Design a protein around this ligand. Structure first.
Ligand SMILES: O=C(CCCC[C@@H]1SC[C@@H]2NC(=O)N[C@@H]21)NCCCOCCOCCOCCCNC(=O)CCCC(=O)NCCCCCCCCNC(=O)[C@]12C[C@H]3C[C@H](C[C@H](C3)C1)C2
Ligand code: HEM
Ligand SMILES: [K+]
Length: 405
């Protein structure tokens, strides 16, 4: 279903891309989005799908719009508009200058120094998960490794009890994998209902966990409100889940399908940090955006106040103008350019945690289970949206080729 073309949008810019069900999906989600980068497609296009919105298709424009928060606001950062409007997480629904100090506070609980303290739990968790699967000679990687992993790391950061995991997973899945039974707003409130009491408790009796630190923080000259803390904690919980789960799945799918790339990292483990970066570029997966604060001419195109613009983080590193031969995976690639973690004032705060999660996973998997394949006759299904992903990833291996610890 195609929204009526707004009068200000010229015919020549119309390309009806559907970000939730793109045409070429069965052939790979990144490939399906890359159709926007074929030579007959303008740098900035309008789709009439999903309510109607702009799409910047090239890294240059994606980066530029992410820098220009004055014109391109995060107040409504998702398509469809109804989701974007309901969304009130902090700092992702806020613009500078206000956003700056909330971002500083979030950085205390997920930034660099915290990463080093977590490293042992990250490595322990990775090992225990992998050892549980290793002698079975099969798993659904997405379900059996990827899903349990980041939620467990978050519980440790946030000092939440282990027994809360299935309920919290239920709540977060309800929000980020909607089936249409709840509005976005309803799902968000259900999540908030879990967080509200905990915030109340930790403002009275704080600990040193992430929730206590956020909930008792100072921002922009005063103490954080209970409401603001709730909106921050919502993001800190969800930000690291689907992104990491789906990114690990894209990476493991590629490695199962490429024995030569596996063998490379097996023979040359020092290359894993570089491989992580090239995989972040090739299997980039996020696509959010902004709303126009005013009428604005951007690269020769008239944009109208309140227009939504999708600025897909995924596309920058797939752009052949940024990386030559963009679909080819090359662990030796020289200037790996991407915006996988975003760009501008909202550049992912979790990027350092995410890289450790990725690198630890790859290192520990390849040393215990070096040889593995997609289950024969399985066709891997991708999903597309704000966080694109893998529906299931059935892998098999001969346990005789594996290394117990
Ligand atoms: N099936 C379907 O296609 C359903 C219909 C399509 C539809 O409207 N679905 C909307 C999906 C809403 C998902 C909202 C997730 C909100 C949580 N996620 C986020 O806040 C984040 C915010 C930032 C940092 C990370 C990564 C991105 C960008 C999303 C987390
Ligand atoms: C592969 C994994 C990840 C990817 C690809 C990713 C991607 C992104 C992107 C694209 C943004 C910017 C969104 C925008 O500009 O509207 C973002 C922001 C953010 N991410 Fe991540 N992320 C990942 C993992 C994580 C993790 C593990 C955490 C830890 C909680 C996290 C926490 C956040 C936070 C708090 C922000 C908001 C920063 C701000 O608004 O100032 N992310 N991320
Ligand atoms: K909003």
């Amino acid at each position: 279903n195609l929204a009526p073309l707004p009068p200000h949008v010229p015919e020549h810019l119309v390309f009806d891309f559907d970000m939730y069900n793109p045409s070429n999906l069965s052939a790979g989600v990144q490939e399906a989005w890359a159709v926007l980068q074929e030579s007959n497609v303008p740098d900035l296009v309008w789709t009439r799908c999903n309510g109607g919105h702009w799409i910047a298709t090239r890294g240059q424009l994606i980066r530029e719009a992410y820098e220009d928060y004055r014109h391109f606001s995060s107040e409504c950062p998702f398509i469809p508009r109804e989701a974007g409007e309901a969304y009130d997480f902090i700092p992702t629904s806020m613009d500078p200058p206000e956003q700056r100090q909330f971002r500083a506070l979030a950085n205390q609980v997920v930034g660099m120094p915290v990463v080093d303290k977590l490293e042992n739990r990250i490595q322990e968790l990775a090992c225990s998960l992998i050892e549980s699967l290793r002698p079975q000679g099969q798993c659904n990687f997405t379900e059996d490794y990827a899903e349990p992993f980041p939620i467990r790391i978050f519980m440790l950061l946030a000092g939440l009890p282990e027994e809360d995991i299935p309920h919290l997973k239920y709540l977060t899945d309800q929000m980020t994998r909607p089936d249409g039974s709840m509005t976005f707003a309803e799902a968000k409130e259900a999540l908030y209902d879990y967080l509200i009491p905990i915030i109340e408790q930790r403002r009275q009796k704080p600990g040193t966990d992430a929730i206590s630190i956020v909930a008792n923080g100072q921002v922009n000259g005063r103490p954080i409100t209970s409401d603001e803390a709730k909106r921050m904690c919502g993001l800190l919980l969800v930000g690291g889940l689907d992104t990491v789960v789906n990114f690990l799945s894209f990476s493991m799918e590629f490695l199962a399908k490429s024995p030569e790339h596996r063998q490379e990292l097996i023979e040359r483990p020092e290359r894993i940090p570089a491989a992580c970066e090239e995989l972040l570029r090739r299997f980039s997966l996020v696509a959010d955006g902004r709303i126009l604060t005013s009428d604005y001419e951007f690269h020769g195109v008239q944009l109208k106040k309140g227009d939504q613009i999708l600025l897909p983080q995924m596309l920058s590193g797939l752009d052949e103008r940024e990386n030559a031969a963009p679909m080819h995976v090359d662990f030796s690639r020289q200037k790996v350019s991407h915006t996988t973690f975003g760009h501008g004032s909202h550049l992912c705060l979790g990027q350092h945690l995410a890289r450790r999660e990725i690198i630890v996973t790859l290192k520990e998997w390849l040393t215990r289970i070096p040889d593995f394949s997609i289950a024969p006759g399985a066709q891997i299904q991708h999903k597309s949206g704000i966080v694109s992903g893998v529906q299931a990833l059935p892998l098999v291996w001969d346990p005789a080729t594996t290394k117990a610890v």
